[PDB]
XYZ file of N, CA and C in Angstrom:
363
model
N -13.659 -19.768 26.321
C -15.016 -19.527 26.817
C -15.862 -18.953 25.735
N -17.173 -19.085 25.881
C -18.036 -18.487 24.980
C -17.993 -16.957 25.074
N -17.802 -16.408 26.290
C -17.722 -14.934 26.455
C -16.500 -14.370 25.606
N -15.395 -15.112 25.637
C -14.164 -14.672 24.912
C -14.404 -14.674 23.459
N -15.082 -15.685 22.935
C -15.505 -15.713 21.525
C -16.422 -14.560 21.133
N -17.356 -14.215 22.036
C -18.306 -13.128 21.699
C -17.561 -11.792 21.617
N -16.641 -11.596 22.571
C -15.774 -10.389 22.592
C -14.947 -10.364 21.313
N -14.422 -11.521 20.942
C -13.664 -11.590 19.687
C -14.469 -11.288 18.440
N -15.728 -11.720 18.383
C -16.611 -11.382 17.283
C -16.904 -9.842 17.199
N -17.157 -9.228 18.342
C -17.294 -7.731 18.508
C -16.040 -7.056 17.940
N -14.868 -7.503 18.345
C -13.589 -6.927 17.808
C -13.497 -7.090 16.290
N -13.883 -8.246 15.746
C -13.889 -8.467 14.356
C -14.821 -7.565 13.628
N -16.002 -7.333 14.190
C -16.954 -6.463 13.553
C -16.468 -4.958 13.646
N -15.877 -4.607 14.757
C -15.269 -3.229 14.827
C -14.219 -3.072 13.753
N -13.361 -4.103 13.578
C -12.323 -4.067 12.576
C -12.892 -3.891 11.202
N -14.017 -4.572 10.866
C -14.723 -4.367 9.601
C -15.175 -2.933 9.402
N -15.726 -2.363 10.448
C -16.254 -0.984 10.345
C -15.081 0.014 10.197
N -14.043 -0.165 11.005
C -12.786 0.660 10.892
C -12.104 0.494 9.564
N -12.158 -0.684 8.929
C -11.601 -0.806 7.587
C -12.346 0.029 6.579
N -13.670 0.092 6.644
C -14.457 0.944 5.777
C -14.180 2.468 6.072
N -14.111 2.803 7.367
C -13.697 4.189 7.780
C -12.328 4.532 7.200
N -11.368 3.632 7.285
C -10.016 3.925 6.816
C -10.020 4.166 5.325
N -10.830 3.382 4.588
C -10.878 3.535 3.180
C -11.458 4.847 2.798
N -12.495 5.257 3.499
C -13.154 6.502 3.233
C -12.192 7.682 3.572
N -11.456 7.604 4.676
C -10.513 8.719 4.993
C -9.392 8.763 3.993
N -8.848 7.627 3.579
C -7.774 7.602 2.648
C -8.165 8.129 1.232
N -9.437 7.992 0.882
C -9.915 8.618 -0.346
C -9.871 10.152 -0.303
N -9.913 10.757 0.873
C -9.738 12.161 1.038
C -8.288 12.629 0.908
N -7.387 11.695 0.563
C -5.945 11.994 0.318
C -5.600 11.532 -1.050
N -6.200 12.221 -2.058
C -5.957 11.638 -3.390
C -4.528 11.775 -3.906
N -3.767 12.710 -3.335
C -2.366 12.853 -3.678
C -1.439 11.758 -3.054
N -2.015 10.911 -2.140
C -1.223 9.908 -1.447
C -0.068 10.453 -0.573
N -0.241 11.700 -0.105
C 0.725 12.340 0.758
C 0.903 11.595 2.052
N -0.154 10.957 2.535
C -0.155 10.299 3.885
C -0.154 8.786 3.787
N 0.049 8.239 2.606
C -0.001 6.829 2.382
C 1.010 5.971 3.021
N 2.225 6.513 3.161
C 3.343 5.761 3.627
C 4.138 6.524 4.728
N 4.925 5.815 5.544
C 5.806 6.537 6.502
C 6.727 7.490 5.888
N 6.945 8.645 6.484
C 8.000 9.555 6.066
C 9.309 8.766 6.069
N 10.028 8.791 4.938
C 11.308 8.077 4.788
C 12.493 8.752 5.579
N 13.126 7.981 6.453
C 14.207 8.492 7.249
C 15.453 8.549 6.423
N 15.485 7.816 5.300
C 16.579 8.052 4.328
C 16.472 9.396 3.725
N 15.271 9.788 3.279
C 15.026 11.075 2.630
C 14.847 12.319 3.562
N 14.370 12.049 4.786
C 14.224 13.084 5.815
C 14.933 12.611 7.078
N 16.292 12.655 7.055
C 17.017 12.050 8.154
C 16.845 12.664 9.555
N 16.442 13.917 9.634
C 16.184 14.592 10.926
C 14.751 14.348 11.442
N 13.939 13.540 10.752
C 12.493 13.582 11.047
C 12.185 13.305 12.549
N 12.836 12.327 13.141
C 12.485 11.874 14.459
C 13.007 12.865 15.506
N 13.836 13.832 15.108
C 14.183 14.927 15.996
C 12.970 15.842 16.182
N 12.098 15.932 15.164
C 10.946 16.813 15.135
C 9.700 16.056 15.610
N 9.454 14.888 15.140
C 8.184 14.140 15.300
C 8.486 12.874 16.099
N 7.879 12.834 17.278
C 8.171 11.705 18.181
C 7.361 10.438 17.950
N 6.164 10.554 17.306
C 5.329 9.427 17.056
C 4.805 9.559 15.570
N 5.679 9.192 14.667
C 5.234 9.170 13.235
C 4.032 8.261 12.986
N 3.204 8.604 11.982
C 2.071 7.799 11.646
C 1.755 8.020 10.151
N 1.060 7.065 9.594
C 0.704 7.118 8.137
C -0.399 6.053 7.890
N -1.051 6.064 6.730
C -2.138 5.153 6.522
C -1.664 3.684 6.396
N -0.499 3.413 5.835
C -0.024 2.035 5.770
C 0.219 1.399 7.118
N 0.747 2.194 8.028
C 1.015 1.764 9.408
C -0.316 1.513 10.093
N -1.300 2.387 9.886
C -2.627 2.161 10.486
C -3.259 0.872 9.950
N -3.082 0.611 8.679
C -3.691 -0.567 8.055
C -3.072 -1.840 8.643
N -1.765 -1.829 8.896
C -1.067 -2.991 9.532
C -1.666 -3.249 10.935
N -1.822 -2.192 11.715
C -2.445 -2.336 13.025
C -3.879 -2.839 12.919
N -4.648 -2.286 12.029
C -6.034 -2.669 11.856
C -6.147 -4.165 11.536
N -5.317 -4.638 10.633
C -5.455 -6.026 10.146
C -5.013 -7.076 11.148
N -4.224 -6.673 12.117
C -3.913 -7.436 13.280
C -4.973 -7.288 14.384
N -6.132 -6.693 14.021
C -7.125 -6.274 15.045
C -6.568 -5.531 16.251
N -5.633 -4.553 16.026
C -4.995 -3.834 17.057
C -5.652 -2.542 17.538
N -6.821 -2.228 16.962
C -7.644 -1.132 17.492
C -8.820 -1.708 18.355
N -8.763 -1.439 19.620
C -9.813 -1.971 20.559
C -11.087 -1.148 20.548
N -10.999 0.106 20.106
C -12.133 1.029 20.129
C -11.839 2.138 19.079
N -12.866 2.899 18.730
C -12.718 4.013 17.761
C -11.751 5.095 18.275
N -11.685 5.396 19.564
C -10.766 6.416 20.117
C -9.314 6.114 19.724
N -8.917 4.860 19.831
C -7.524 4.479 19.502
C -7.218 4.740 18.008
N -8.173 4.420 17.145
C -8.098 4.634 15.707
C -8.019 6.140 15.420
N -8.917 6.870 16.021
C -8.859 8.335 15.830
C -7.570 8.950 16.320
N -6.991 8.449 17.386
C -5.708 8.935 17.862
C -4.642 8.837 16.764
N -4.597 7.689 16.084
C -3.589 7.464 15.022
C -3.923 8.428 13.842
N -5.198 8.564 13.462
C -5.502 9.510 12.366
C -5.122 10.947 12.697
N -5.359 11.355 13.916
C -4.986 12.711 14.326
C -3.452 12.871 14.313
N -2.666 11.834 14.614
C -1.229 11.919 14.503
C -0.776 12.215 13.074
N -1.417 11.539 12.114
C -1.033 11.817 10.701
C -1.153 13.320 10.454
N -2.285 13.905 10.800
C -2.571 15.301 10.527
C -1.652 16.228 11.337
N -1.633 15.986 12.652
C -0.920 16.885 13.538
C 0.585 16.871 13.290
N 1.152 15.714 12.977
C 2.585 15.601 12.683
C 2.929 16.480 11.450
N 2.052 16.366 10.454
C 2.299 17.128 9.222
C 2.221 18.580 9.428
N 1.228 19.022 10.185
C 1.033 20.443 10.448
C 2.115 21.098 11.324
N 2.858 20.252 12.032
C 4.018 20.744 12.793
C 5.280 20.778 11.882
N 5.561 19.690 11.189
C 6.787 19.623 10.418
C 6.822 20.545 9.220
N 5.662 20.738 8.588
C 5.559 21.527 7.366
C 4.970 22.866 7.614
N 5.371 23.928 6.933
C 4.822 25.258 7.112
C 3.503 25.409 6.466
N 2.767 26.415 6.885
C 1.429 26.704 6.362
C 1.314 26.851 4.880
N 2.341 27.378 4.194
C 2.333 27.639 2.763
C 2.736 26.433 1.870
N 2.667 25.229 2.411
C 3.155 24.079 1.711
C 2.011 23.204 1.274
N 2.238 22.427 0.194
C 1.198 21.509 -0.257
C 0.943 20.439 0.809
N 1.968 20.082 1.599
C 1.773 19.084 2.651
C 0.853 19.553 3.768
N 1.104 20.756 4.308
C 0.214 21.313 5.328
C -1.210 21.400 4.837
N -1.323 21.946 3.616
C -2.658 22.192 3.043
C -3.407 20.855 2.850
N -2.680 19.809 2.462
C -3.308 18.489 2.288
C -3.840 17.999 3.634
N -3.062 18.226 4.702
C -3.524 17.830 6.025
C -4.753 18.556 6.507
N -4.833 19.869 6.236
C -6.034 20.601 6.585
C -7.260 20.019 5.886
N -7.120 19.764 4.609
C -8.241 19.263 3.812
C -8.646 17.862 4.279
N -7.657 17.032 4.597
C -7.928 15.666 5.145
C -8.633 15.759 6.484
N -8.201 16.638 7.398
C -8.851 16.847 8.657
C -10.334 17.275 8.472
N -10.556 18.204 7.587
C -11.880 18.811 7.419
C -12.822 17.789 6.834
N -12.373 17.121 5.791
C -13.188 16.088 5.122
C -13.357 14.826 5.938
N -12.364 14.450 6.701
C -12.403 13.269 7.566
C -13.363 13.439 8.732
N -13.562 14.664 9.196
C -14.423 14.929 10.355
C -15.817 14.408 10.124
N -16.300 14.580 8.901
C -17.660 14.184 8.520
C -17.836 12.640 8.664
N -16.836 11.924 8.170
C -16.765 10.463 8.154
C -16.704 9.956 9.595
N -15.846 10.589 10.380
C -15.681 10.174 11.764
C -16.875 10.479 12.651
N -17.587 11.566 12.389
C -18.818 11.874 13.107
C -19.805 10.714 12.957
N -19.965 10.161 11.747
C -20.991 9.145 11.590
C -20.456 7.791 12.094
N -19.158 7.556 11.975
C -18.553 6.367 12.513
C -18.802 6.261 13.993
N -18.677 7.346 14.726
C -18.941 7.328 16.148
C -20.390 6.955 16.481
N -21.319 7.530 15.754
C -22.719 7.165 15.932
C -22.897 5.655 15.685
N -22.287 5.086 14.628
C -22.426 3.626 14.271
C -21.789 2.702 15.302
N -20.643 3.121 15.813
C -20.001 2.359 16.850
C -20.864 2.290 18.107
N -21.378 3.429 18.567
C -22.331 3.495 19.706
C -23.649 2.754 19.428
N -24.231 3.044 18.268
C -25.491 2.422 17.848
C -25.400 0.874 17.834
N -24.544 0.292 16.973
C -24.353 -1.190 16.922
C -23.721 -1.772 18.210
N -23.071 -0.930 19.025
C -22.404 -1.352 20.270
C -21.048 -1.953 19.960
């Protein structure tokens, strides 16, 4: 149907905007701490601690399959990256501190993304 095509074009355009958002958030992680999944070879107990692991590579795979239907779903995955780290790692660690800085700097990006998503529809 033509309606299904129009919905699909909306999803494609959201995916474009989320790809630019993802790039901007990932630039706030210049150490690449959140780039990849925590390795279960290297951290074998991880899934005992963290029930829903997340990382920027995993988000990018979902994004490119157009698997984010709305900005809320995307933000949920970004908050998992941060929140998982802040639980597993102690406050005095470079990992925790990187997550705080990513959260703080990412907030600015996400505030305007929400306005653009609402604005363009």
